Each structure stands twice: as C-alpha cells, then as structure tokens.
Design a protein around this ligand. Structure first.
Ligand code: MCO
Ligand code: ZN
Ligand code: ZN
Ligand code: ZN
Length: 232
C-alpha cells in the first residue's frame, strides 16, 4: 500500500499515514536516467504539524504543502532538515516563504552553505557529538554519528514508535550504498549501531528513499554498507 516511485509523477507528492499523527511524504525526481522516490515525515504537534525534510526541490515542496493543506488541514509551523542534500533542504525557500520555521543542525547548515544548497533559518543546538539527542516537540532528534553524511540526523517519534532514519538507512530493495559522495563509510556501521542501541523498540523504520520496514532495515543497511566498503 506504500506509494512506489512508479505511482507518483514527478511534481506530485503522496502522503502515507504510518501511525496516529505520523505520515510520510513521498515525492520523486529523475536523476541520471532513472526515477527515484524520496521520503520525509510529518508529525502532528498538537494542532500544528512538524515537517521532517522537504519533498526534494521547490516544485515538489510546494506540492507537499498543498497536499498537507488538503489532506491534513493543520499548519506546518516547523520543519527540520536531517542532512544537507537537496532531498532534505531543497525547498527550504518554499517552506520559508510559506511561514514555516526551518531548522537544521549547525553541521547541516554549514555543509548546505558549502554546497550552495538552501540553508534552514534556525540552528538546532545540542547535536554536534555522536550520540547526542535533543527533544524537538513530538520527536527526538538524534545524531548517531557520521554515516550517509557527516551531519545526518535520525528522528524518533516516541508516541508512535516511528524511527525515521533518513538517508542513513537503506530500504530493503536497495543493494548499493546509494550516494556515498559525502558518506563516512568507516563510521557508518558504528553509527547504525548507535541507532539500534537507542531505539530497540522502534516498530516502524522509514528510510530516506523507498519502502518502510522494521528494525531489519538497520542490519540490512549495515550489510549494504559493508558490501560497498569491501568493493574490489
Ligand atoms: C539527492 C539525493 C540525496 S541523498 C541523492 O543523492 N540521490 C542519489 C540516490 C537517490 C537520490 C537521487 O538523486 O536519485
Ligand atoms: Zn543525502
Ligand atoms: Zn537522500
Ligand atoms: Zn539486506
């Protein structure tokens, strides 16, 4: 029932209810001759919404806001970008123009600036050291250490037992390590271990791309990263 990359035209966004007050948002983009999906999260924050990650670009992110307005009808007041790549910050300007307060760690903001990407307005303190966790309304933000990127955050929704791994966690169907241009391959397995150790009760695990699963996604990611590391 989860929207697959084939069912979503580029420019459109789907919402998927994961649990009470938790949705993923799914968008797509073409890249290098293929089409890829990308997930973010929406978490009900009382009578407001907390958005995790843009929908990968300005056009998708405008479509995301329109779909949230139509399907949920609560204002998106804050957004957190979980790393500095365009599937996480691309569209921050659209959110900002819609009155959403945009947030990211100083590490993400610094890297987004280096990359020339959009830069969230606010800085999330307390996440600079591997293993650091901070509460942000209805979620916990956790910096597990460097993995897919040096700044990657994961997001846990304690009320729903939803672990959003972002692009540090791979869906089961992914056999390669994905875009490793900014990755710390040597630290990625240890960073995954920190996630496993902190959220062993997670019932839903949402990768940054593709289908949700369970905590099995973490061991799968470890295997995929190790296979990439061992490339010959
Ligand atoms: C823009 C994102 C950032 S994780 C990216 O690097 N990639 C490569 C894999 C999926 C997505 C893409 O461009 O297809
Ligand atoms: Zn990325
Ligand atoms: Zn990604
Ligand atoms: Zn596997």
């Amino acid at each position: 029932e989860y929207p697959t990359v084939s069912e979503i035209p580029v420019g459109e966004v789907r919402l998927y209810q994961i649990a009470d007050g938790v949705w993923s948002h799914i968008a797509t983009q073409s890249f290098d001759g293929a089409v890829y999906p990308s997930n973010g999260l929406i978490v009900r924050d009382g009578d407001e919404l907390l958005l995790i990650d843009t929908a990968w670009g300005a056009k998708n992110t405008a479509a995301l806001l329109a779909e949230i307005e139509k399907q949920i009808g609560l204002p998106v007041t804050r957004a957190v970008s979980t790393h500095f790549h365009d599937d996480r910050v691309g569209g921050v300007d659209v959110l900002r123009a819609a009155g959403v307060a945009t947030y990211a760690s100083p590490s993400t903001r610094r890297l987004a600036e280096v990359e020339g990407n959009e830069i969230p307005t606010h800085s999330l303190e307390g996440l600079s050291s591997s293993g650091d966790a901070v509460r942000f309304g209805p979620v916990e933000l956790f910096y597990p250490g460097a993995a897919h990127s040096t700044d990657n955050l994961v997001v846990y929704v304690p009320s729903a037992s939803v672990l959003y791994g972002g692009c540090a966690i791979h869906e089961l169907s992914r056999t390669s390590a994905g875009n490793v241009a900014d990755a710390d391959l040597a630290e990625w397995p240890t960073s995954i271990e920190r996630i496993q150790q902190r959220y062993p009760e997670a019932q839903f695990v949402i990768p940054g791309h593709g289908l949700p699963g369970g905590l099995d996604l973490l061991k799968h990611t470890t295997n995929v990263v190790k296979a990439h590391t061992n490339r010959s």
